[PDB]
Design an enzyme around this catalytic site. Sequence first.
Site, PDB file in Angstrom:
ATOM      1  N   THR A  10       0.832  -1.194   0.000  1.00 55.63           N
ATOM      2  CA  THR A  10       0.000   0.000   0.000  1.00 55.63           C
ATOM      3  C   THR A  10       0.874   1.253   0.000  1.00 55.63           C
ATOM      4  O   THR A  10       2.104   1.194   0.073  1.00 55.63           O
ATOM      5  CB  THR A  10      -0.944  -0.004   1.200  1.00 55.63           C
ATOM      6  OG1 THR A  10      -0.216   0.331   2.388  1.00 55.63           O
ATOM      7  CG2 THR A  10      -1.585  -1.373   1.370  1.00 55.63           C
ATOM      8  N   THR A  11       0.221   2.409  -0.071  1.00 52.59           N
ATOM      9  CA  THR A  11       0.918   3.681  -0.187  1.00 52.59           C
ATOM     10  C   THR A  11       1.115   4.309   1.187  1.00 52.59           C
ATOM     11  O   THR A  11       0.168   4.413   1.974  1.00 52.59           O
ATOM     12  CB  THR A  11       0.145   4.640  -1.095  1.00 52.59           C
ATOM     13  OG1 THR A  11      -0.102   4.010  -2.358  1.00 52.59           O
ATOM     14  CG2 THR A  11       0.941   5.917  -1.320  1.00 52.59           C
TER      15      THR A  11
END
Lengths: 249, 242, 231, 195, 244, 111, 241, 244, 249
Positions: free
Chosen positions: H31-32
């Site tokens: 994920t970011t």
Amino acid sequence: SEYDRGVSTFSPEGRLFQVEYSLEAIKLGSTAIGIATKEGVVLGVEKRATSPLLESDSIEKIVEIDRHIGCAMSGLTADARSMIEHARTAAVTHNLYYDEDINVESLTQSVCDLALRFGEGAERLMSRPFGVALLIAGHDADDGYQLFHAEPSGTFYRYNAKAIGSGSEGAQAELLNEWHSSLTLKEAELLVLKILKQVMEEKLDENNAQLSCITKQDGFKIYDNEKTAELIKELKEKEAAESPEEADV
Amino acid sequence: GYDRHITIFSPEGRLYQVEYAFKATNQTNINSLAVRGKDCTVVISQKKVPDKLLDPTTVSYIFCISRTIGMVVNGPIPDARNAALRAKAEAAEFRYKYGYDMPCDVLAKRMANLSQIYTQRAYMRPLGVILTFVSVDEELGPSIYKTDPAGYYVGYKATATGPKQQEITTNLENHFKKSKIDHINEESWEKVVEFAITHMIDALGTEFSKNDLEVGVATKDKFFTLSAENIEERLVAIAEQD
Amino acid sequence: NNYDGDTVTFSPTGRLFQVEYALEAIKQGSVTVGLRSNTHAVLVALKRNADELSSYQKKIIKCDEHMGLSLAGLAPDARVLSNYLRQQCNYSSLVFNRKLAVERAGHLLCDKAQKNTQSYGGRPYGVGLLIIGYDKSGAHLLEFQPSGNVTELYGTAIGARSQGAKTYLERTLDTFIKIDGNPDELIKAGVEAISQSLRDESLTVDNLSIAIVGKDTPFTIYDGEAVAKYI
Amino acid sequence: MDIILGIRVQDSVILASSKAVTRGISVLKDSDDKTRQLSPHTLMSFAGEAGDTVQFAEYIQANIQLYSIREDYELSPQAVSSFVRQELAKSIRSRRPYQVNVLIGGYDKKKNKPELYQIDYLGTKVELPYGAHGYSGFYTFSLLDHHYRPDMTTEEGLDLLKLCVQELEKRMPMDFKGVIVKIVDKDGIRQVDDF
Amino acid sequence: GSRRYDSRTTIFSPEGRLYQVEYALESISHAGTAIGIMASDGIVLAAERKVTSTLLEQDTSTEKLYKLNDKIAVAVAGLTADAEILINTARIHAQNYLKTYNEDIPVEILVRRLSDIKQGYTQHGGLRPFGVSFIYAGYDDRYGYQLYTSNPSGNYTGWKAISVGANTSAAQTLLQMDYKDDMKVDDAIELALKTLSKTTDSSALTYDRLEFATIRKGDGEVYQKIFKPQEIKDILVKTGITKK
Amino acid sequence: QFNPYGDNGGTILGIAGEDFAVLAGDTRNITDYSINSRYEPKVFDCGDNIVMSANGFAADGDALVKRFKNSVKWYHFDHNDKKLSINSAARNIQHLLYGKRFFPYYVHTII
Amino acid sequence: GYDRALSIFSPDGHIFQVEYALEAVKRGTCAVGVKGKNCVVLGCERRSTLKLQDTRITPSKVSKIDSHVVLSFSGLNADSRILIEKARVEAQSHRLTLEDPVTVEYLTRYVAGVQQRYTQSGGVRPFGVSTLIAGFDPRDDEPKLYQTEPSGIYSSWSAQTIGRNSKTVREFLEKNYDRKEPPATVEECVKLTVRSLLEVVQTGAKNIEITVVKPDSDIVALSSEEINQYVTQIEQEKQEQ
Amino acid sequence: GTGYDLSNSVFSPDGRNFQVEYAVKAVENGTTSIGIKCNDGVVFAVEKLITSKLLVPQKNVKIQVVDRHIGCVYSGLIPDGRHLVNRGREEAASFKKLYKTPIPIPAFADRLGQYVQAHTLYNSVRPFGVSTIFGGVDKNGAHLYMLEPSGSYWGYKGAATGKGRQSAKAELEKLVDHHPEGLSAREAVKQAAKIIYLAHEDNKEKDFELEISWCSLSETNGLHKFVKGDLLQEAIDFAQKEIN
Amino acid sequence: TDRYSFSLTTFSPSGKLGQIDYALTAVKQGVTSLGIKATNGVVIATEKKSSSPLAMSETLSKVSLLTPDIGAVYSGMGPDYRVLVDKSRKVAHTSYKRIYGEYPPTKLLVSEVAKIMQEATQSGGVRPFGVSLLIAGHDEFNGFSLYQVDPSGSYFPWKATAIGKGSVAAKTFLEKRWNDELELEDAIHIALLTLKESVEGEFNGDTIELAIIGDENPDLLGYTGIPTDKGPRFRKLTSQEINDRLEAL
């Protein structure tokens, strides 16, 4: 890539390679059949001597863990010596620590704890899992008479009747059909003898097979060859006297 | 075979992981040069900060080992900082055990022996870094000593490391071939810094701004990395010259 | 093909394969479902027997008077992890007179599993765990995978046919989250969830295991006739 | 302490050892054989701290028997004495040293000669015609020095040991309850029926 | 991890053979020839320097015959450095036996100790075996004179006359042809020299390419004599192999 | 020097009946001629109908009581849920005490 | 530090290192053991007959573990010396801690356990040795003969052979050994043993070496002259047809 | 040749460690996560993909605290990131114990970097599978660092890693260009929420939950604190308004 | 976690030791270095080939002092030579001087270095040293001696020899030019001639290293007052001396 992967490597199907290979080795072992009834637990083994010059008395495939716990082995029987030693020491040590007999399930779990103690790196462990399965029979006041199958996978199962080894596949099929909750001790002995004779490559006599029992009263008693021979004659007379018929249909 | 994966001899008698570490040393695409003054020692390194999200003050390949020894690394920053920490610890332990500051060549020999251990033992890989230590040793004067991933180390009147090293080296060689001496005959270290920057501009053929260079100066009692404004002052002094 | 020999190999796509093989070992395991309300937490597990003469493998383990877990996969690895969790709860209770937090237990299990997935030698664990507990924060349900990923949920399930139980719990989320102060109803909800994952099989007294924890209700196991009232 | 005596007559070695073991104010046993047959032609008598004596003697016995089995050969009495001396010397500076004094009597078949070695708990080995451990020597030597001849027969040595035992039974503050006497010669090790 | 680089030295072939043992024996087959002969009144060791050069200082050179003890010596065939390691260990073991029992080391005990070391190197540790074959010539008061031989396999045997190294088949054939139980030490010297001169891959057998040793009885005391180059040249010109 | 032992006084008494048992103790904890507390109980219920007291060095008493409760917990964990018989508990306490044979728990124990 | 798992399972269920050690045993010299009514005879074949060998110092195939128990082997001699050393040390330790010499079954079990450990330890290959352990228990006149294989399996035998051509000798024994009537006298046992060995050695009597064990530690190795007498007696009947 | 990518710490003919790059690939699959350095502190933000609505919101925290002032958020293999945070906590405890003052941010960054670089030195350990953005406030002000599996770490004005790393990096470049004076803590929080919402489009397959923490000398007195309650909702509303 | 406990140099089916032969090849690909024994001293020499004229060739010593009477030169991998020189300087003290109060004899120091290199060839996780050493020493009882040590751990005493690229041809020049009645200066001249044959670049005192184990130099002892203690035998020739003997030629 046998010796080119880790000894604890998982197969793509979610299994351990060495565990399945040891299960195959056990499939290549001798037959061992245990039957548990409300009167006691009976263990029978095929000695499977390699030559007639071998003294069949020295084929000890049924051992005593404690007065209330007996064990039969099937597979690479050399691997089972350390497990039997650990089981006996753990049983007597629990006796020393708690002034009481160790439960059957506790002994079986303590034995199974050694199964997956293999791998590389390090105290060290073992190179390979065990190549032998165990039928651990016994009795305690909590769960009565108990029979357990202990595999090199660290997993153990409570069977009412279990066959392990080469001729196990057919033998188990017979057991599932021949067992009931009202079976007696002599009935269990005769059933073990019959299924052994069916699955054994050799003609079953008192020299290539061995019986033993676990009772709450007398403990773990290994049947001498004379009593096993008398039971074999009794079973032969019982089978020779059965009279079914399907000539009409 | 597997003689190309671990530090074992190939049939030709060569260690391929060592050569590949040498190749990896130039991953930074940065060149460094070191020269000796009359009483100082200067190192110049290219400063390349591609991403504008980077703190330009944290992009450095020159390390202050001790108060006398500086070390410029050609190679990736992980192995660079590993070698930096190890050299700092070695210098501190040397000072503690032997009562005097660790000389430049001694630290170079220590790091080169560690590199040799990596070259011979298999469980550890060589560090893909080339280490140039510079100082003003109390017994030897201005000192430049370089070590490589093969365990080899030696001192230089001046040296260069990186992709264009040969070019730089040749340039430096030429100047000394013209000067017939082994150092830059200038009393102030600022002029030696200016000399180094000028000859790097000549060799590489590129113009440097104040944010394109790292300068490390070692004087008889100190080793210090110049600020961007001091570098700009040196660049202005160079631009004013002919 | 390659990159699957060790847990020390990352593969060109950045995938650890031995960990995925352990996850597959879980997938081929038995069915166990977990769900919790605000006051209780229930584990419903479907035990599997080797044949008709064998017993049904126990799938729920008690770790402490306030916390337990259900297993799916290798029973030995489940025993090892549950013993480590028992030891951690015991340390919390003895050295700090403090019941071990469920979230901290999940963190410890995650780190314990990760330690095996980064070093040469030794295999990652081969069992998924569903941990129910009731700490000072309330009821908690955690799902632990041998990849080291532990996630807190209102309800979940792992093993064979887990998607059916998961979808049922998703539809019944607003229903069971409000089943507060009624243990038997949450048990019935869990039984329905696990039934949504049966194929050609029926829940019997011998193949069903239940576990309940919550406020004023220590972690208790129900097997045999004790589950007959829910079948 | 316990009485440990030894004499070397021509073609024989005679060892005498007290039969009494007393712990406290009660004599626990009046029939204690304080010897260990290391090899068919080498015997060792021992005395000293309780427990350490028997332990050290049986340890040496096991080592000598293992050597004799491995090489199918009996070690010379000199070699056994050197081995026991090295063991005791390693013991003296250990955590809990052995406080055991030993007399080794053997018959070297290669030389066909009797040999008697005296070793203390410190590892001080000497080959002597007559030896004793404890206070026993303080008396016996004075007799032996006068009545010992190198060409003495085994019966003469037995009579000399009887005189020593009489002197010990007269001028010693303790009743060692007699002595077990053993003779080691070319034909092995035998025990005198009654002394 | 590192398992891909493990040679697995201590493994059996499908036939039941140790790979590294066979390969070390093959290595020793290319080494120089060493011959021991045990006569009724002594033992003689004769070894051939495979590598020979005109600038090799043979006076201080010792590559084939080493002194384990004043009563026991060894002829080596194979890797010199592994042999020197084993020789240091053997000397240490002999001196330990002497310190323990105040009696000089028996020959078979030392030989068996070295052979057990080799066996341990061929069963565990994952290390390469020593590429060395030893011919022990010793004397003790139990078995008198003794000639033993040990190979990288960890097996040791006793011989009246034996040869290790290069051309062992032809050398053994010649020895078996010419050996007699009643021969004396000088006859054994002649036999060893003739066997070497007939089994040498070199043009001719000269003193510079030879190491010689005699364990004799001349007093009731044994003498271990490592021959000097001049003594070797003298015995060569006497036996008729060379001319002076 | 540091004395690793101390006395907290106190007195405990155990009487066995036909179908019952009673274990009592004073609630006073002292040190030398001073009172540390007037209600520091020393008779603890450990479950499985086993009451235990270790009177003497209060630190060693608390340590032994905690160790025995932990031992009954692990006994339940490792042996299904079998009740710890009073003789089994006594043998386990004997082993607990003898573990520190050379550093004894300065407590007289009664269960 | 070397803990490489060398003895591992194969996909079919075999431990290839154990089977290859068994193959190494097959390449070893033949050894046989026969149980009489009051004695046990161990015979061993020697590799051909070389006259440059020193027969007085070369270690014989039959080695004594204790005054009452002996052990012959087939396979690697180097691996056999380790087992013999461990067995002698354990016999002395059992005498030291039990005040009673080892029983044949106990020593056999110890050797089998050592071999089994060597089949399940890291960085260690199994023994390329199969052993025959013969003797008499203390204060017992019943003969004891056992066989141990590299896999760790041990078992008692009325008569058994291990080594090269062991199948032929085992056939000969199964043909000529009556369990009902074991060789009563020592001469009968030695005669059956020498015939069993001569059916495979094919060479002279120098290849055959015989040792006989009788109760109360009565172990003696037969001289070559007695072996020649036995071979001549058996061959005389061969002419009879 | 070939096969240089099967063992860690093995240099390919290029000079690369392919296992490290494969770990970077594993990071890119995560994920970011982003970090933004403001004028008086740092702000960390991360997206938590809602695999199922059965997940309890606000639980399953992804940002970890080190000491009392350091924040760390890792994208990639979360368990490896937890291991790295535990090691960093051990380093911080050691530093504070010996050196009274809490561990400075550059010291902590170098500790983590040396740990990971050690993990890139042996074939018995696999490289880390998480890119970690961390930092906090020390005596020298605010510091924001990012560390890659190669052991390479740098100080950033703004950092981003994960699936939506490119859009986040572009937005951070825009913020750095448009704010030379520096952002404030609360503005950095709202801008970080916006950047997370913008970078979610790269991995818009599943809905996400925003998690933000901050360490500010003025807003949190220099202590790492999780943004909760009103500030979280305000940042979420700011981002949602920017999206639509 | 050094899991490389197994040997990296094993026997091939041909009997050759792979890494040993490869290290010998690496030695053959090194700069030539030679040694010559005379009646009043020994000489060792080598070419000091530098990478760049900016590099200081004097700061890199190919001829190193082991003991005041023992020095060594090499051919092969420089770093291996440096670490071996350090190990040899340490082993001279630890395993001799600190035990017998005197510096080790040439033979025993060579044997120690040979043991180190053999262990490198046999131990686990290590490659053999890629160097060949020429060690020239002097002791009171054996006089002057010159030894060669190969990567295999073997060592040989030489009257004169050489190693490296142009070794073979150089050795021939030594075979025709050597005699057992040679003085130290004659050996220096022969060594210089052979090295000039084996060098391609410039040949001056700045590109050649050359040391001698000759007479005792009390001027290099550093202290006066002990008549029994004389100066060291090892002396590295200055650039001026080499250039003078070249101007003689």
